[PDB]
């Protein structure tokens, strides 16, 4: 029945939003890491 079908779709969306949140968190972590790396490299250049 359409009730069950759309209900299951809503449930799957409940998981999909969490998955996308996790992906966003991963991207945030990656950008933070690269920022730190470039920031420390700039200081290593000044040391040299």
């Amino acid at each position: 029945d359409p009730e069950k079908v759309l209900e299951q779709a809503v449930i799957d969306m409940q998981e999909d939003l969490v998955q996308l949140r996790q992906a966003v968190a991963r991207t945030i972590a990656e950008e933070k890491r690269t920022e730190q790396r470039l920031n420390q490299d700039t200081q290593e250049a000044k040391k040299w």
Binding site: P2, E3, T27
Partner: protein, 48 residues
Amino acid sequence: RNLAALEAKISEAKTKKNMLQARAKAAKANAELQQTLGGLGTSSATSA
């Protein structure tokens, strides 16, 4: 001099390969996220 050159080669190859692999993994993860965003199946409730 050969040791100096070999050490330079090893360090550069290792670091470049590692960063390339990490960036490729990040890119494929982002592409998968975009596919999932486009791949949402909650529309199946139209049957119900």
